[PDB]
Structures are given as C-alpha cells and as structure tokens.
C-alpha cells in the first residue's frame, strides 16, 4: 500500500508535472495516514499545493499553506508559496513587495529572484526577463536550471546562436546525458550553414553512442547527411562518406521498425528510398 | 470549409493533455478537414523533427489518397492569439503545394463549450467569421477522462510501438 508514497516521491524527484494524479493521491494521503507517516508530510504539502494551483482548485491551497504556517512560523519557503498564491490570483506588486522583503532580510536567497522573473515573464515581457536572468547569472553561476531556461527563451526569441553558448556551458559539465548534445545538434542544424551541419551530424552521433537507442538522434543524422549530399560546396569525399553514413543509418532504422512490426515499414521504406 | 467532429475532438484533447505547453497539430483532408494529428508539444522552434514528420505523413497519406491542407497551433498562454512566425512559415510552405490551405489558432480563452481561423488568399493569413453535436461529444469524452491514451508524434519518437493515427478514438467517437 505504501507504494503511493514512493510514487509521490518519484514524481518529486524526476519532475513530472501533470497535476491530475498528484492532487488525487495527495488528498488521499493527506488524511489520517499523516500521523502514521511521521515528520514527512510537509514535503507532501509543498508538492500538493503547487499541483493544486495547476488544477485550478485553490481550495486545498490554503489548508496546506496554513498547516505549513502553523508548523514553520518564521519560514521563508512558505512565504514563497504565498507569493505563488498571490501571482496566481494576479496580485503582482504585492508579490514583488513580498519577494523584495525576504530578499531584503536575506540577500543570498535565490527563489525570490526566480519568482520575480516568472512574474515578469507572465506579464508577457521577455526582453527584460532575459537581462534580469543574466544579471542573476552574473553572480550565481552553477545554476543549470537557469541556463536551460535561458536557452529556451533565446530560442523562442529566434536567436539560435547564444542558446548554443548556454548549451555549451551546460553539457561541458554533466557530459554523460544524450539530451543536451541532441538539442545542441538541433540548434545548429536549425541555424543553417555547412560549418554547423558538420557539427550537427557529429553531435547527433555522440548523443547516440551514449544511449544507443535514441531515435531523434538517428533521424537527425540521416537528415543532416542527406542534406550534405546535395549542397554543392564540398569535395567529393564529403559526399561519398555522407552517402554511406545515411545508408547505414537507413539500415539501422529498418532494423528498428522491423523489431517494431511484431504498414509502418511501407512508409519508412518510402522515406528511405525517395532520396 | 467544414469542421469535423473528430478533428475538433483530437485537437482540444491534445490541447488539454499538455495544458501548460504550446502545441501544434495537423489536419488532413483528402474544403473538408477529415482527421487531426497531435504531433508535437514543447518548444516547436526547431526544424528537423518537423521536417521528418511532414515527410513521413506525406509518404503515408499518399497510400490513402489524403493531403494535409491544414495546420493548427495553440499557444501555452491563454491570453494570446497571434500567428507567430513559425506557423506562418509552415502554412506558406503548405500552400506552396496546395494554395488553399487554412491556418487555425484556438482562442483557448473559453476552452469549454473557440476557433480563430485565418486564410491567406494572397493576404498575410487574415481572419474570417464563424461558419452543436460535436460540442456535446467533446464535453462527454473530455469528462470521460480518456486523454491519457492519446498518442502524439513526440511520444512515437520514444516508444515506436504507438500509433499516431490512434484509431481507437476514431471508433470510440463513431460509437457515440
């Protein structure tokens, strides 16, 4: 039965916001089992509150927040949760006073800045959020979540060149996960330029050697190579090696979809052959 | 210029399964739109996956004599309805091969019992005016809590064993 606890913990660990199941299991486990659980419920309240905000209810929010208040009176985290409550109901300046206060009584506190920025972004404004986030990063380096958010924001502003610099800062450290290299390759391939596609195939490869079961990296390599084999600016040797790259990748994709098939094979073979 | 019940169904379903992220999908006709596809959610300013999805859906729709003729986006923020560059590019590319395809953006500020159709017609995807049982179907199936088995293309890239056509929903709405 305790499985519910471990599933909640899982969703806490690998952030998996869906805020439909969470609130259910929370309200189930917010009951008498609380006294059974023992000194562990508080995190479950901090986790159910946010998912509830995500579901629209807002009724369970104050119950969880007031439990938190009564246990931890002079806290800071519950203050952040009150700021969240405010900004959901669209009291922005109040929340700003709050965050500036608990930064004023604690300058080396990050969460207040990272909520001020969420507010600045929820208004619609981006360009000032970016410089605020950089002025933050100008002090609190080693904030990987921030680097990834910055990369996403530069992407949605259609500046694909500095997002790559952030991804460099972010896959230099923790260089054992495919996702970062893959997203770097997608950035570059989108950026255009042969000098970049030569990197796109490289990193779509390295991101495959690691996992060796990813699929997006595979199609990425296939498309990068196939497009190299038509750009009339490279010596023959380039094109002849990219042809074999693409053909081998095609064979491997054939293997994969064959495993899958136990009608798709038709369409994928068409895609293969048409070039 | 007709709205198919199942199209709107899959459309708003995808909009609801990932309700805090911007999504796009894709309508396929043989103007009557005949089937929706949920393909992506996330950032969406990135070519390769999009390019291969378009290619594969072409290779597959030829078999059944269908052409795409239709796009739709739904931003993450509710209070926004504006055809960001990306969708404009994708619809100008689709109308290079159809020259009658229409763009859709769901208002999403009502999201209960919405459409904002544009049209190029030599203009930069300008607006038009509103042109039921499918509404009831939508409401019922939504409250049926069934969106959790609706597969998009982004899921297909992880677990190949899915089926982006998801005929289960098709037959399901057929029974209604």
């Amino acid at each position: 039965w305790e499985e519910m606890r471990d599933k909640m913990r899982k969703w806490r660990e690998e952030n998996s916001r869906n805020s439909e199941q969470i609130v259910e299991v929370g309200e189930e486990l917010i009951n008498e089992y609380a006294s059974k659980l023992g000194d562990d419920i508080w995190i479950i309240y901090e986790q159910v509150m946010i998912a509830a905000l995500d579901y629209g209810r807002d009724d369970l929010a104050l119950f969880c927040l007031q439990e938190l208040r009564r246990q931890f009176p002079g806290s800071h985290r519950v203050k952040r949760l009150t700021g969240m409550r405010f900004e959901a109901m669209e009291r922005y300046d109040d929340a700003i006073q709050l965050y500036d206060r608990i930064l004023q009584e604690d300058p080396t506190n990050t969460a207040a800045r990272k909520r001020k920025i969420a507010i600045r972004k929820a208004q619609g404004k981006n360009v000032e959020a970016i410089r605020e986030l950089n002025e933050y990063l100008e002090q609190f380096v080693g904030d990987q979540e921030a680097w990834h958010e910055l990369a996403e924001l530069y992407i949605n502003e259609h500046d694909y060149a500095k997002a790559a610099f952030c991804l460099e800062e972010l896959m230099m450290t923790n260089p054992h996960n495919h996702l970062y290299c893959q997203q770097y390759a997608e950035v570059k391939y989108t950026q255009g330029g042969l000098e970049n596609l030569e990197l796109s195939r490289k990193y779509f490869a390295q991101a495959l050697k690691l996992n060796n079961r990813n699929m997006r990296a595979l199609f990425g390599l296939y498309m990068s190579a196939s497009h190299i084999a038509s750009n009339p600016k490279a010596s023959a040797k380039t094109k002849k090696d990219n042809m074999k790259y693409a053909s081998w990748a095609a064979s491997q994709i054939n293997r994969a979809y064959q495993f899958a098939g136990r009608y798709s094979l038709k369409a994928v073979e068409d895609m293969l052959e048409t070039l | 210029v007709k709205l198919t019940t199942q199209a709107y169904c899959k459309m708003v379903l995808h909009g609801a399964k990932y309700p805090h992220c911007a999504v796009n999908g894709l309508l396929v006709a043989e103007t009557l739109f005949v089937d929706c596809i949920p393909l992506f959610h996330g950032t969406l300013a990135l070519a390769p996956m999009l390019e291969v999805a378009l290619t594969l859906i072409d290779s597959w729709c030829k078999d059944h004599s269908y052409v795409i003729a239709g796009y739709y986006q739904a931003n993450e923020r509710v209070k926004d309805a504006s055809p960001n560059q990306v969708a404009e590019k994708v619809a100008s590319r689709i109308a290079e091969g159809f020259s009658d395809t229409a763009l859709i953006m769901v208002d999403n500020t009502k999201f209960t019992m919405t459409i904002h159709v544009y049209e190029h017609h030599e203009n930069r995807w300008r607006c038009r005016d509103p042109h039921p049982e499918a509404q009831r179907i939508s409401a019922s199936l939504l409250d049926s809590r069934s969106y959790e088995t609706l597969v998009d293309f982004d899921n297909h890239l992880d677990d190949i064993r899915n089926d982006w056509t998801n005929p289960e929903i098709n037959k399901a709405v057929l029974h209604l």
């Binding site: 380096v141 259609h158 950026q191 | 560059q85």
Partner: peptide, 20 residues
C-alpha cells in the same frame, strides 16, 4: 530535392571575434 526545407531566422563569456 528536399520538399520541406525550412529556414527559421552580453551573456557572460560570449564573444564573436574568431580569436586564434
């Protein structure tokens, strides 16, 4: 012939100068 070819188009420690 690739039918669907798309073209879409201060951070501390970033310069563009092709430094050797």
């Amino acid at each position: 012939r690739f039918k669907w070819a798309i073209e879409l188009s201060y951070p501390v420690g970033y310069l563009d100068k092709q430094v050797p």
